[PDB]
């Protein structure tokens, strides 16, 4: 099904988001 593909894609987006926020805040000298 393309569903297992869409579920894993949404899950990958959500998984990357939080670490991405921390990474941007660390790279740009944010208030971590």
């Amino acid at each position: 099904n393309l569903e297992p593909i869409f579920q894993l894609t949404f899950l990958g987006l959500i998984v990357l988001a939080g670490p991405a926020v921390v990474f941007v805040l660390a790279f740009r000298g944010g208030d971590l």
Partner: protein
């Protein structure tokens, strides 16, 4: 099942309830980014 106008975002709905676990893990990720100070 979701109403027919929303059956599009069904794969997104199936992966939503897990996100607070990711919040708990993100606490640790941020601590590791700050070196567990």
């Amino acid at each position: 099942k979701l109403p027919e106008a929303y059956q599009i975002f069904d794969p997104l709905v199936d992966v939503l309830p897990v996100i607070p676990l990711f919040f708990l893990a993100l606490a640790f990720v941020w601590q590791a980014a700050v070196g567990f100070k």
